[PDB]
Design a protein around this ligand. Structure first.
Ligand code: BEF
Ligand SMILES: [Mg+2]
Length: 1006
């Protein structure tokens, strides 16, 4: 049963075989529960933890470490060789559980921000003639449902009859409309009307606001409007976050490097196993040089890279949680740092979705045919009665204003809504209509009777001032609102007997024939009528767009005996002459943090767009208010509707999404079409929103931010949830996503620089013929411990000063540039020659070591030979740990100096001293003290074939290590062009180390 809005209530009730008087029978209900099922949406599938770790291995970087560990395992099968593949598996497993523990922790925080109040419904079934309250899931299409004020709609209902005079429904959840909609039972002929044009339909998820009505259910479960939208959110595809796309692009670059050094080492060693060795076949000799080349490629892959990447994201996600921001995924904490466009819903997201009175005026002075108006302003933005009234922007008390004392009397009495406080969530709510709760919240702010509010708690502070006025004036029968008169009045007697009327301005003021100037009753003239009406047009038509409501009273009404409370026409006949008292202005006001945030986002180069389902009047008026538009800037080509964007040319649609900042009256499917167009322009789009009309857009975007007050369907599609409804947290999230990305490039270069330095060392050791300086067991401790501590501390780098004053990064540029590749190639070639040059120095030029020649070292496998050229050298000295602890200490000391100049990308170490990052200087003292731990404890100098040094050897380590700082400061200088307490500290060190004279004395090749 679709398009039930187009059919009359007779044919809709006839289709289900149901009568409104009696209702559905038990035999029809179980029959319909078979065909249709439960009136509930399928619960979102929390994926198995075993399937959760599967996406933790979808990353390309961890797949390279799996292939590296799987390769290193089979080469060991042909137990210290099994140590490296075993710890790589633990690193990948411990890294995967942290990614799973975060997404599991993020969930438990989001579903904690949910009100699991049981959803019920009041149906009319043939079992009992009276109404019965059943569960919502036990409702089937065809049920006659009766829902009154304050009740949530259980299912899609076709209205059959309105029991009250008018029915008002709050549909901001599904349509984004800020104002309550009036409903009728007459059919809407258009078979493809939008949910805002179906005025004879009650959609599920919405709530009634004013009256009482009955209807027949036409859809349940996934057939409801919230069900069709949720099905659309599931149908949308989810692309990878831009950080995962950068890391994967770097993963193909890391793969092309290790594949080159594996192919290069192989081909330079080809034609070289035809030697008289245990070969015999070319196919058997290409296996030997393959096992040494692939072992060299695996040694180029940084083992601890994804583990320090996860720590940087997990430490950042913890920083957003303190700002009341729940991030589902780890890579989604960077997306806002590269966001170009922020698309934002208006109702509930940019505004509070809570009607607030912010302007009111009464009469001050009337000399003749002209007057002066006392104009006030109120500061509240929510339903909480926490506000202050300001006259001439200075705090004013409304006690000495007799016109304000009677203005609050009409506002408190004439409305029939209320303001309750729920300690469960801790926020005040509206009971009836939103515009009548705005009057209730106003009366509490302007304490006209100066009641004592210090001792009262939150529950009675909601209706403290209102109940006072009710005690002064008891409420008799009410002349309720009629659409033709467009006004509402009440009858009240003191504990005389005035009549209070409230309605549209021009409708009320025209009936008014007097003015309440303070305490006097002054006859109103057409001159002062034009002035107060001019202020109404100032509030209605200006950029200060406000819903205006005129408040008046009747000093001499005839008694209840002569009243006829059955005719709409006589209602305007009982309030013919009234006394104009004042007028109030209310709107759905933007959140207090939204105004400054669109300004901070503009400096950061981020463009904010309003994509709302409400009309372009309210949409543009809030755009001018928050700062998206100027108070006088025209929006002819910058503000579109859902329709006006449909009949736009594709060429005109291009500069629409590129130059338009407001989109009004758009369907839930339109919101994701706009997000899709913005990503077609290659932009990282962030969607902020609440309600069901935003769920497809929240998923389609690169990152979707939901409000804590939003719906559950909205928080499901979103990657981030603002728990406290703080729009400033989005600006703080952009600043963190930019610092994390900057710091991520720092410890990515630092880590791949350390591995290329170890590859050049092993390659150079093979070409020169020297004994092995660095064995793979100590290359594991270096990359994990001495490299992991400074790389983790590089995530704590101080953020730039112009970090939020520059455009977002281009999504095409990679992590490692072409220049940054050469820059870490230079570092890698240094550590290769430094570590080999430090082991060779002990073998050739050191005092304590044997002073063998280069020939006598290139052929160290021929020493126990009788006496070819090895006259007096021992063969055991070629297995000595002293040249191995020389190359390990230089490697560790260079990485400490390379972590020191990885504090900034281009800024020098004099301009940015190392104590800028106190975690970096503290982690270096830890990696260096853990290196001295390996040398002097009992068992570890045997696990690593190394030995403690002396001061003469340790001074040589620094002479080889320190020039890596001069080498990078030189590249930093080139990168830029194309303090004093720090200098006076390093200078005593540089002169003390370099005062001694020493050489390497490698007369041969290198
Ligand atoms: F909730 Be939005 F204004 F569509
Ligand atoms: Mg909304």
């Amino acid at each position: 049963m679709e398009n039930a809005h187009t059919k009359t209530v007779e044919e809709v009730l006839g289709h289900f075989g149901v009568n409104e008087s009696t209702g559905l029978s038990l035999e029809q209900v179980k029959k319909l529960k078979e065909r249709w099922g439960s009136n509930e949406l399928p619960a979102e599938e929390g994926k198995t933890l075993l399937e959760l770790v599967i996406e933790q291995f979808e990353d390309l970087l961890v797949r390279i470490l799996l292939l590296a560990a799987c390769i290193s395992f089979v080469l060991a099968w042909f137990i210290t060789a099994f140590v490296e593949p075993f710890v790589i598996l633990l690193i990948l497993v411990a890294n995967a559980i942290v990614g799973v523990w975060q997404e599991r922790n993020a969930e438990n925080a989001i579903e904690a921000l949910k009100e699991y109040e049981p959803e019920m419904g009041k149906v009319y079934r043939q079992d009992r003639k009276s109404v019965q309250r059943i569960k919502a899931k036990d409702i089937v299409p065809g049920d006659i449902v009766e829902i009154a004020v304050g009740d949530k709609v259980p299912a899609d209902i076709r209205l059959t009859s309105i029991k009250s005079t008018t029915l008002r429904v709050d549909q901001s959840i599904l349509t984004g409309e800020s104002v309550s909609v009036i409903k009728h039972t007459d059919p809407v002929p258009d078979p493809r009307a939008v949910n805002q044009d179906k005025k004879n339909m009650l959609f599920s998820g919405t709530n009634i606001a004013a009256g009482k009505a009955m209807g027949v259910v036409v859809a349940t479960g996934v057939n409801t409007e919230i069900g069709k939208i949720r099905d659309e959110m599931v149908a949308t595809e989810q692309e990878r976050t831009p950080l995962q796309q950068k890391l994967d692009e770097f993963g193909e670059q890391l793969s092309k490097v290790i594949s080159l050094i594996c192919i290069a080492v192989w081909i330079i060693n080809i034609g070289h196993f035809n030697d008289p060795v245990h070969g015999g076949s070319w196919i058997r000799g290409a296996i030997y040089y393959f096992k040494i080349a692939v072992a060299l490629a695996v040694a180029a892959i940084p083992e601890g890279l994804p583990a320090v990447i996860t720590t940087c994201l997990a430490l950042g996600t913890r920083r957003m949680a303190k700002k009341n921001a729940i991030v589902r995924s780890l890579p989604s904490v960077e997306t806002l740092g590269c966001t170009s466009v922020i698309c934002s819903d208006k109702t509930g997201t940019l505004t509070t979705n809570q009607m607030s009175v912010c302007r009111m005026f009464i009469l001050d002075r009337v000399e003749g045919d002209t007057c002066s108006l006392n104009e006030f302003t109120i500061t509240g933005s929510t339903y909480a009665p926490i506000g202050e009234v300001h006259k001439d922007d200075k705090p004013v008390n409304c006690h000495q204003y007799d016109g304000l004392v009677e203005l609050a009397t009409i506002c408190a009495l004439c409305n029939d809504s209320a303001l309750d406080y729920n300690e469960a969530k801790g926020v005040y709510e509206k009971v009836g209509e939103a515009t009548e709760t705005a009057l209730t919240c106003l009366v509490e702010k302007m304490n006209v009777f100066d009641t004592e509010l210090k001792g009262l708690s939150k529950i009675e502070r909601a209706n403290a001032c209102n109940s006072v006025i009710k005690q002064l004036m008891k409420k008799e029968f009410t002349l309720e609102f009629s659409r033709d008169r467009k006004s509402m009045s009440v009858y009240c007697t003191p504990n005389m007997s005035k009549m209070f009327v409230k309605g549209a301005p021009e409708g009320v003021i025209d009936r008014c024939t007097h003015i309440r100037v303070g305490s006097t009753k002054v006859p109103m003239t057409s001159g002062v009528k034009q002035k107060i009406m001019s202020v109404i047009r100032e509030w209605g038509s200006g950029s200060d767009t406000l819903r205006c409501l005129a408040l008046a009273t009747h000093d001499n009404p005839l008694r209840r005996e002569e009243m006829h409370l059955e005719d709409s026409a006589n209602f305007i006949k009982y309030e013919t002459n009234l006394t104009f008292v004042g007028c109030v202005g209310m709107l759905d006001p933007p959140r207090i943090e939204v105004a400054s945030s669109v300004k901070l986002c503009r400096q950061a180069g981020i463009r904010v767009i309003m994509i709302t389902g409400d009309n372009k009047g309210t949409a543009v008026a809030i755009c001018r208010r928050i700062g998206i538009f100027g108070q006088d800037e025209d929006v002819t080509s910058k503000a579109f509707t859902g329709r006006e964007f449909d009949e736009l040319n594709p060429s005109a649609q291009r500069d629409a999404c590129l130059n338009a900042r407001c989109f009004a009256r758009v369907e839930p499917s339109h919101k994701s079409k706009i997000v899709e167009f913005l990503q077609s322009f290659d932009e990282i789009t962030a969607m902020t929103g609440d309600g069901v009309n935003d769920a497809p857009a929240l998923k389609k975007a690169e990152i979707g931010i939901a409000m804590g007050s939003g719906t559950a369907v909205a928080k499901t599609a979103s990657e981030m949830v603002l728990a406290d409804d703080n729009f400033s947290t989005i600006v703080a999230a952009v600043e963190e996503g930019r610092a994390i990305y900057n710091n991520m490039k720092q410890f990515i270069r630092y880590l791949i620089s350390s591995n290329v330095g170890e590859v050049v060392c092993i390659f150079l050791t093979a070409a020169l013929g020297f004994p092995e300086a660095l064995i793979p067991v100590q290359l594991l401790w270096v990359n994990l411990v001495t490299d992991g501590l400074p790389a983790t501390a590089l995530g704590f780098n101080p953020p730039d000063l112009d970090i939020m004053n520059k455009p977002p990064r281009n999504p095409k540029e990679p992590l490692i540039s072409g220049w940054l590749f050469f820059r870490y190639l230079a570092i890698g070639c240094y550590v290769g020659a430094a570590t080999v040059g430090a082991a060779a120095w002990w073998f050739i030029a050191a005092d304590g070591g044997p002073r063998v020649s280069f020939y006598q070292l290139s052929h160290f496998l021929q020493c126990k030979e009788d006496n070819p050229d090895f006259e007096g050298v021992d063969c055991a000295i070629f297995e000595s740990p002293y040249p191995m602890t020389m190359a390990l200490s230089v490697l560790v000391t260079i990485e400490m100096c390379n972590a020191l100049n990885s504090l900034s990308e281009n800024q020098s170490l004099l301009r940015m001293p190392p104590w800028e990052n106190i975690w970096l200087v503290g982690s270096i003292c830890l990696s260096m003290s853990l290196h001295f731990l390996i040398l002097y404890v009992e068992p570890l100098p045997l696990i690593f074939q190394i030995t403690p040094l002396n001061v003469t050897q340790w001074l040589m380590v620094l002479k080889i290590s320190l020039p890596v700082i001069l080498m990078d400061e030189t590249l930093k200088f080139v990168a830029r062009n194309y303090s004093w307490p720090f200098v006076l500290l390093i200078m005593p060190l540089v002169i003390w180390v370099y005062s001694t004279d020493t050489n390497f004395s490698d007369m041969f090749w290198s």
